[PDB]
Symmetry: D2
Amino acid sequence: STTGLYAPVTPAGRVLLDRLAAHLPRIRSTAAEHDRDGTFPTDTFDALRKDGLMGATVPAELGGLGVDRLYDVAVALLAVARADASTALALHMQLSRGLTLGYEWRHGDERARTLAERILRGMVAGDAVVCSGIKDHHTAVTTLRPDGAGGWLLSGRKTLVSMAPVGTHFVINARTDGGPPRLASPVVTRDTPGFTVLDNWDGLGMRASGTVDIVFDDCPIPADHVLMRDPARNDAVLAGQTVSSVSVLGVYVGVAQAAYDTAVAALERRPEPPQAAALTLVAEIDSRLYALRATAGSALTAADALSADLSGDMDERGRQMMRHFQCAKLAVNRLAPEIVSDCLSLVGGASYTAGHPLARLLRDVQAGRFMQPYAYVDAVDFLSAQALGI
Amino acid sequence: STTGLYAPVTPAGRVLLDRLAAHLPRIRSTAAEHDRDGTFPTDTFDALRKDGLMGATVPAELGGLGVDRLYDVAVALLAVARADASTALALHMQLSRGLTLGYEWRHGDERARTLAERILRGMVAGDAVVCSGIKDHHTAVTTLRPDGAGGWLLSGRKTLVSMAPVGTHFVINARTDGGPPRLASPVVTRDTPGFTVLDNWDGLGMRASGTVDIVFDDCPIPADHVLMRDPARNDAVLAGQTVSSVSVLGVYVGVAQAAYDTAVAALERRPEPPQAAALTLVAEIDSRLYALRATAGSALTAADALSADLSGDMDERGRQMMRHFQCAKLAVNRLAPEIVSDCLSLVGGASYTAGHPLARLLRDVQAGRFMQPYAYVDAVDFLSAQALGI
Amino acid sequence: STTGLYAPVTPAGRVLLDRLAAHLPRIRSTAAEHDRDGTFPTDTFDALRKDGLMGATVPAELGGLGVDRLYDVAVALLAVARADASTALALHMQLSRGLTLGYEWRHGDERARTLAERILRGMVAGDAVVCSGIKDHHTAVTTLRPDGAGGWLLSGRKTLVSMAPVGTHFVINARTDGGPPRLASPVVTRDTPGFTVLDNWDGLGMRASGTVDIVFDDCPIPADHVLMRDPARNDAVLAGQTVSSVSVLGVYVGVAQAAYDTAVAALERRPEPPQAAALTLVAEIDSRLYALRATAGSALTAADALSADLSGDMDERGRQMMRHFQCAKLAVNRLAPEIVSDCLSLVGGASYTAGHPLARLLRDVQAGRFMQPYAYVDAVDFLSAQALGI
Amino acid sequence: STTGLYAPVTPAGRVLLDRLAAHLPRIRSTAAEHDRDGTFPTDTFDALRKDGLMGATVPAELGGLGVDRLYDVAVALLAVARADASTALALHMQLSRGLTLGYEWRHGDERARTLAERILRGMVAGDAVVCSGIKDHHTAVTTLRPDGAGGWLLSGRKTLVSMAPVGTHFVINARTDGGPPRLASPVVTRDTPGFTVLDNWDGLGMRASGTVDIVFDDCPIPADHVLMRDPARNDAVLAGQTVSSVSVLGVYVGVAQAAYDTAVAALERRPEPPQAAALTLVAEIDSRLYALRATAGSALTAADALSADLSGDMDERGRQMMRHFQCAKLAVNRLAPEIVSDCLSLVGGASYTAGHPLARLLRDVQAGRFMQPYAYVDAVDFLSAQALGI
Ligand SMILES: Cc1cn([C@H]2C[C@H](O)[C@@H](COP(=O)(O)OP(=O)(O)O)O2)c(=O)[nH]c1=O
Ligand SMILES: Cc1cn([C@H]2C[C@H](O)[C@@H](COP(=O)(O)OP(=O)(O)O)O2)c(=O)[nH]c1=O
Ligand SMILES: Cc1cn([C@H]2C[C@H](O)[C@@H](COP(=O)(O)OP(=O)(O)O)O2)c(=O)[nH]c1=O
Ligand SMILES: Cc1cn([C@H]2C[C@H](O)[C@@H](COP(=O)(O)OP(=O)(O)O)O2)c(=O)[nH]c1=O
């Protein structure tokens, strides 16, 4: 199978999915409690760490499983999400960081490569859990200031940092302010002075994903723990943002799958044969889920092809990767919640009590809409700009 | 204004809405806490009781405000629901019971009239809070058994009984089992032996509505506290079920209104002018909300006209009332959640944290789908049967 | 019945609908031929003229039937449209002109009143068939130029002028160019020199509606055949544009009704009982048609109420009338074509051959989308401007 | 590119698409006239015949181009459909017959192989144009009767036979009636006595596709021109029906593409920058078209994989092929017409006149809904049966 995210397409992808199977039963078992209490499943992550799955996307050269297709990462996230979407969303941050650090390792200058290499062997060993602090909190602009002696001091606050509760290393999007301002990616470790992880995530869904705020109060960062980016429009950069986020589409596809599976099981348990409207819903969902899978799957296949090809116009490459990502994302964010919603009509009133799985899937399935890049309102400006050559 | 539920159409309806205004600020203020904890707002109901609003739909002959249009009851529920939908849903059970007891009073035999009259002056006084126990729990069929001395013993369990926590009187749908079986409406009071109110409502939404189970363990009911119904298809009965439930459409209309109002306020608070997709969403919502209001409003106007006219074929009357109700209900249950959902796209990520009002409106707005009569799957069998003359 | 356009709400409205019934059978009978050939049904209009129905909306003071509610005009258009939508669309231009000329008659200065009065008794007599030339063709800006002796010369070209083939009088939106420019409504009669009616309408639907272009080549117009308007934003003018166009919503409602009626008749003719998907479609359509009727009906009731009340802020009055019109129009233009489309799924492949009635209804039902004011793209700018107080 | 039908995936597929390019300009040029008059473009087909493209899917062993992927056939149909959908729909019947005859040739008994081989070299040479007469007209059940001397006589009538006007050979689905009844595929040639091609296709769309009825009045068919099928449920047969029809999804995808391309060109031609609603429509269409392509493309890739694998349970193989086909078909038949419809909103009123390309695309895009297998109502019974293991 090379379509619909039905199966991994490479040998490493298969091993990844086989190894994950052992962990599914714990993931499913504790999901309801962590959602109710809003707490991160630290024990699931301890098991994945010692089992080496936290290094799944580290290059085999460095001792990792060598998963290097986005498509296979999404197939694994989908399987995890059918068990618990919060765990999948947190796992995606680790897996996709494996992929972009792997590219720094192979194409960065010596500073990037050395640093990337250290983190990547960390990930395999179980010692490095890598979170991404991307979006500034509204009270703050996260800035790096020279320390006077050749290093830096980082101040600010980032929001919505998933997996933060077990994070050991945090890649932070910041700008300088000591040249003219440049974008920089300092890496802060958890024991850096001035560094606090807050405990303030209270989600409608993704309740267990640890999607908290992190605060930097003059955190000393040494020069070789900073990847300087640039200044300045640069489309080629869209490619890294795609690699960073596109596989997360597997999460919302798995949520829709688990809703459908729940609804069908419910219908089969009944003495009465399904009513006319239930048969029609089932057929409509079956086809919508197919179109959901085919759309995520194809944009993932296309993204993997463009990702592997470095031989051309890098700006065109980044626009094309982002256009595949965004076209598919908008479709996913409309289809997945529609499917989940229609599933509640099949099960009926039992799905409206707080503990039923569908009631949680209805909350978790909404989270994709708000994840940048891009939320709906911004996606429409991006897409119409690209389509009309603005 | 005679359309869209924009304003009450009778003098008593206006008084009702004016008097409710005093209570809105407490209702809005405590909504978040009661949703979080899942607890019934007993203090709001204490205030409505002593203010006489719990008698709003009692005939003026008996000292009530004399609200007798469904349309005006829905206009009042809408205003309450913009403050808190759980409170509105519970209030609807009291108000619509005012209307069906008022019909028992004017058209019942002497047993019904006497009993109805006692309860109705109760409601005005603040002493009677009347809940409806309609749907059997799956473990039980609620049955009335003769006690050997001319009275009855009631056993069973009813589910989803809103307002039960403050209920003093419970109208219960039961069947006999001492003739051949008949449908009977015994009225049980809270201090009857064998009668328990459970504390088991844990909703995805409508969390504060007190929608709990109630249990009957050989509850002694005297003969004059039982309204015997019949055996046996009887379409005329559809009219009472319509009167009982149709005004609750105002609840879901108010939820959609409060979502839109929230979204618009959010857009106006921003320094930036809205993006192209936000302007288009606003226009689409504005028109969808209009169609939502016009559909609920017209079915309520039509229901009031048919309700008042007793001069014809009573079976045709009941089919027509139920057809207006069900056509409008299906539209309401698709339009209202769509509006609320689109509102989250306007506000963006802040609406996905557990405390934001939209996150609660998204949960509460789903409840209409599951309320009988009829849930989606059964509505489709009813409607296609009527349209095709089956 | 006061809702859903199910029945006229005034005695004159009832007479109008009763009198129209005689003409329905010819209208239905010739519809297919006129659609195929693209030709205007001149014989239907000859019959309506001599029967006096072309004066239905002329004040009884002047010998007309005195229909003065938009709601009743829409109920009559709906009945005509179930027979043929092109005939209804052309009839709407006559009927609504009855209403706006009736307002000129009662509130214009002596020039307007005298002219309005002459035309209105024309309409009753069968001698005046009044078309509206509103939109400039792209090659031309229709301008009135003083003739040097106290009258005017009209040049330009208007497009999409329905009913033009039998039109005797044409109210034309023009601007002066002899003060500073003003808007003017010259009335041109068919025998004016320089005046040509073209024969260039080739519609996907509304094929028989005579929606042709008309050309003015220095047409001499006397001063008392010109209603001068103003210069300059003026919201009060929205009220006349609403009166002019809002009742045409009945046309698209009748098209949806005739599609549903066709589909249901088709299902009842079959030996087999309907499949599960057909029962579900029937219920969905039944409810969508209800919401369609309730939305058009309520905006028509609201428009009639605001129309009759001249006692207040005239600018607020015009914004409110247009907002009711536009909210309802957007809903109508999405719901009506959806219903018609779903009807083809019920009938199946027979509805895809050129002669089946549904194939024509699918074409005619699209025309509302393109009629100003406002087409979809402009409606969204109007509605979001009003909702956000821009 | 291996997704979205953006490009053929094999060398023969590329040659096919390159060779077709020469013919596109005539196809586009004559489309409007053939739609207006309802006439088959015999000259386009004469050119494809002599150019050998009518043999594109004949095995290279027999002198054909050897196109053997459904995916590449759909990529070619899409390119043709952007020029004219009727021509594509007719071409699909020839191309897919290349594929199922190619399977008879390689896996049939000697009767099938010999006959298949003769026809297939015909197709390459330009001498054989192969139509499929599948669906019985309602007045007739098409039956083969033994002629008493070892051959057969064919009577009946088939409907909706596309390409019939230039057809030289007609594969007919029939049942015997001389054992117990069996299904048989007699092949009738155009000069057989008793064989008439009628001239009765009058479509809302696909007007030029020659989709006429054909009549058999005791047509003598020799025994070696009959492929006997079986009696009796047999799921394995679903695989041939899939191969026969699945590539036609490319037709409706090309129609949606040509609508979008038209709309975008229209927006770019305007002096004014697009309004807020137009930008939002453009982004929504861009994403819907992506999901349309990804869904058709993936079901075509999956169908090609299952088609090539003959090594397993043949009944499971046929259920899986048909399930991919039907899931995708239902999505295509909702997405493609929605896109085309939204395109008319972008262009506005010009798209409602009979000659504008969008007005034709709106008609042609509806045809997929009615093509078996399966039309919507039957697809829902098939899909819900498969999903619920009925
Ligand atoms: C350009 C490019 C970058 N990357 C990786 C290397 C960088 O670490 C990373 C940048 O990702 P991200 O942080 O999402 O981009 P930004 O810095 O714009 O927020 O992406 C790829 O994996 N592939 C690529 O083609
Ligand atoms: C027949 C009818 C009943 N009613 C009232 C009187 C009865 O108390 C009540 C029955 O309502 P309900 O309990 O909803 O009906 P059922 O007994 O079928 O569950 O409805 C009306 O208000 N109007 C009517 O026309
Ligand atoms: C202001 C107003 C005008 N009218 C009528 C009188 C004018 O003849 C007519 C103007 O309609 P119309 O031609 O649609 O407006 P415009 O001149 O802006 O195109 O509307 C009403 O019927 N009611 C009103 O309240
Ligand atoms: C079983 C099978 C048949 N075919 C071809 C061989 C037969 O000629 C043809 C039957 O197609 P079709 O006529 O669509 O099936 P039916 O006879 O049920 O109408 O399909 C394949 O191409 N692949 C297959 O796997």
